[PDB]
Design a protein around this ligand. Sequence first.
Ligand SMILES: */C=C/C1=C(C)C(=O)N/C1=C\C1=NC(=C\c2[nH]c(/C=C3/NC(=O)C(C=C)=C3C)c(C)c2CCC(=O)O)/C(CCC(=O)O)=C1C
Ligand SMILES: */C=C/C1=C(C)C(=O)N/C1=C\C1=NC(=C\c2[nH]c(/C=C3/NC(=O)C(C=C)=C3C)c(C)c2CCC(=O)O)/C(CCC(=O)O)=C1C
Lengths: 471, 469
Amino acid sequence: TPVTLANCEDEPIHVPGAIQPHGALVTLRADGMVLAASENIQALLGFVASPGSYLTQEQVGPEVLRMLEEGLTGNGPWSNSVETRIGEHLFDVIGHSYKEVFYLEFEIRTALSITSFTLNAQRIIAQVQLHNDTASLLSNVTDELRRMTGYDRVMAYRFRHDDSGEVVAESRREDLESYLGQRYPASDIPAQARRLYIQNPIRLIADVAYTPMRVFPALNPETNESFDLSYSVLRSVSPIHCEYLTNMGVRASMSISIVVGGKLWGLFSCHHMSPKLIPYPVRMSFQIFSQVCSAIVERLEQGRIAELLRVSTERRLALARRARDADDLFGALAHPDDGIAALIPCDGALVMLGGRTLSIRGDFERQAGNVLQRLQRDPERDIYHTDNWCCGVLAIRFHRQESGWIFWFRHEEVHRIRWGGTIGPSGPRLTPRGSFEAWEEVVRGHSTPWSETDLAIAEKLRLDLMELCLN
Amino acid sequence: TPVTLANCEDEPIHVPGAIQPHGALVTLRADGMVLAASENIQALLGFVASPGSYLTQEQVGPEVLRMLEEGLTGNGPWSNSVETRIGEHLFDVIGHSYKEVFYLEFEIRTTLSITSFTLNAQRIIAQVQLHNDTASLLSNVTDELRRMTGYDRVMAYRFRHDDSGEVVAESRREDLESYLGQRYPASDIPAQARRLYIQNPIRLIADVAYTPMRVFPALNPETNESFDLSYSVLRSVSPIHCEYLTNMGVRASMSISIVVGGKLWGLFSCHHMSPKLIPYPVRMSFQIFSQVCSAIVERLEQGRIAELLRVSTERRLALARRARDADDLFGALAHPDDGIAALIPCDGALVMLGGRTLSIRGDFERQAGNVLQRLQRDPERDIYHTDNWDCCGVLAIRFHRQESGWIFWFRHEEVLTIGPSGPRLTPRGSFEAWEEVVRGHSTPWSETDLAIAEKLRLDLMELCLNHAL
Ligand SMILES: */C=C/C1=C(C)C(=O)N/C1=C\C1=NC(=C\c2[nH]c(/C=C3/NC(=O)C(C=C)=C3C)c(C)c2CCC(=O)O)/C(CCC(=O)O)=C1C
Ligand SMILES: */C=C/C1=C(C)C(=O)N/C1=C\C1=NC(=C\c2[nH]c(/C=C3/NC(=O)C(C=C)=C3C)c(C)c2CCC(=O)O)/C(CCC(=O)O)=C1C
């Protein structure tokens, strides 16, 4: 089936039957039988992988057969690399096992120093341990990545709870424009491409305008279903994503991944306006920056909600003094710097006890009237929140007999930073300007999400006004 | 002048002027002229350059003269490595520059070069990504080290405030004895050992019964003072620590350092009961772990107190509410899980106001009485604390001066083959040498405890002046 916009969602990009020509593939079964190969296995590998033939030291060499043989009898999913001369030019020979099949991949040797990488990994461990902000390691390491590799541009994305993603970091040649503060949707990265970005630390496209070197046979006879190139390194790129880059005028791609638990938290994307390829051992070197950042960013966000937790249980002890000192809360809760309006990031708030109604920062008495009416279907629902409806509402109930409530509200997510001052067939939706527009229709009517912590607190305050109201 | 127990605290082990046999050293200067060499240069490298000699292309080879030439052309601390054949075998050419002198060291190569170093790492730096408990991170990368390296035993040290170290993780083999919960004086690791352990992530001892392969000349002509070998990997070992390891039945060492800022926070100590050696590409696969791990111990500690604080200002909200919804300053402080009892880690606590007092966990009024009698010297003190004194650790604050409002938190005291120099060079001989260093003392008062006792005094200041109504 042809792959257009209505199909781009489900389009299998793991089983393309194709690869990139910068290397060759040979797929083997449980015993070592050649099930198929890229039609270019004789471009530089002087021999012919004939469907149904076998491995021979006269085609592949000692070290290769040696390695492969280790894998067919390998305990855990087999994966490894080997540098040995195959034919007349030198090769990087990397393989791996997936499902019940086996794969081999051959890269030519582009004629690094390790100490010179273990050295400026301290330029990054040091540089971010004075500064302690995830935004500044992303910002910092993003600069360092550019220097290490030479990529025309390199960006760092963060992925929100909606898998939307933003450009929170950038280093580019001043010859090019900027994409900082860019918000593209969850669509631009489909469930089956993102799943791949997690299974693979690094993904590398050597050339975008490349011609797909299909591997044949198309289907693997044992199963009669398309082979699964998920962990493949030369796997072909989606034809839709290709048109994207060549519109952006970008001709190469490499992506270090940041994985927290099981989420794609963010990744460093590196474009290059001309065909750029990096040797394999160098990409296993960056696969190391991958885990590092996923491990500092791990406890930065878990050492920064602990800060939010600190300053929100301080300004929640303050209202334990102010409120018992004078004795009717409508005072302490309206306090400017401490007190509810600031306690939980919002664009407004409301306090409701008895008949009195204190609307901090705006007239929210009318909305609160509706939110309590739709709380008559839910009696005994001492909490409520929503990102649509002034469409942000978070409400807790600290007193039942007398209407005892607290409201915080929000507006649509406002684009933090904006800017001001070559088309493809499949439409204009395939460009930066289009990605942004298609995000704007997703959040239309959607207020910033109530964060995991913005709700921990809401449930804490309600627990203080509980023992504070009663007595 | 020999080195005994008496000197060993000042032993200049950074300038030994000798190396471990398994490799060779060649000291150069700015312009690339040889200044010295180990006495085993010919045993290992086919050729023998002279004192004063220039680069002998015969000896080092093209790719290495390419490395040295970009090290002479450029300032600041230089660092790099190569692989090449020199003589019958081939080596790791591991060169650096410290101060103004150069050092080129050579180690055997017994092969995946750019894929072994990068393979070993993802194996252990993902051991740091897995837990949230800073005792788990230590218990685990200890076990994972044992497995990666086959070392007979590998330990994890946590260094305390006084610099005395504690063994907090261990995986030995069933034959060996346990060293878990062993405590040893800050002197076991002399001033310049604790320095080199910080300025150098990894330290490798090939053989403890080894015979030092002295480098000559012994005095650098340029300066007329011994060679400074701080950032060296084949530097000789102190005779005292050798005699210590052969007392323990140990001949092979390799330790990963943990530096949290400028302190030696702790380290992983790998032992082996028979000679052992780790390839250079695998030692750098650890030296990079050393840094990330210091980075993650960094956050796992600054996030562990940022949690203590959070639980402090929460149970400060417990008594603030309990004493303000009543007039019971005492009752509120008294509670089992809230208040002074469990606000700060203590073996006892005591609150005074007027002629009344209550002491949780014992009879502390007798001692507070004397802590006061001693504070009639400079009445102005609002905070006071030390670890010496009966119940030996006292943290005291004052919240109401007119009626002697005081708060106290108390702490008790901290819980056949032989050498040419004595028994004291043994695990048992060190556990006692620590039972003397910390006697009279008690668990120090952390930067955190103090920051809390302070927030609790202000907290009580405000609740007393608040009975103005
Ligand atoms: C509906 C399917 C897709 C559309 C539409 C599309 O544009 N790409 C689609 C599938 C894939 N996207 C893949 C990676 C990917 N896509 C984006 C989208 C962007 N949004 C932006 O605003 C910008 C730039 C300003 C981009 C590039 C990004 C950022 C990425 C990640 C890699 C990169 O940054 O270049 C993707 C993976 C392909 C592969 O490597 O196999 C597919 C498929
Ligand atoms: C005053 C000189 C020394 C005394 C006394 C001493 O005990 N060691 C002295 C010199 C050095 N020690 C060095 C490292 C070091 N020493 C210990 C001592 C231990 N105490 C214990 O209880 C145990 C085990 C149960 C030991 C091993 C330790 C732990 C270490 C750190 C390295 C390791 O764990 O192997 C030292 C550095 C030598 C070097 O490598 O240059 C010197 C010098």
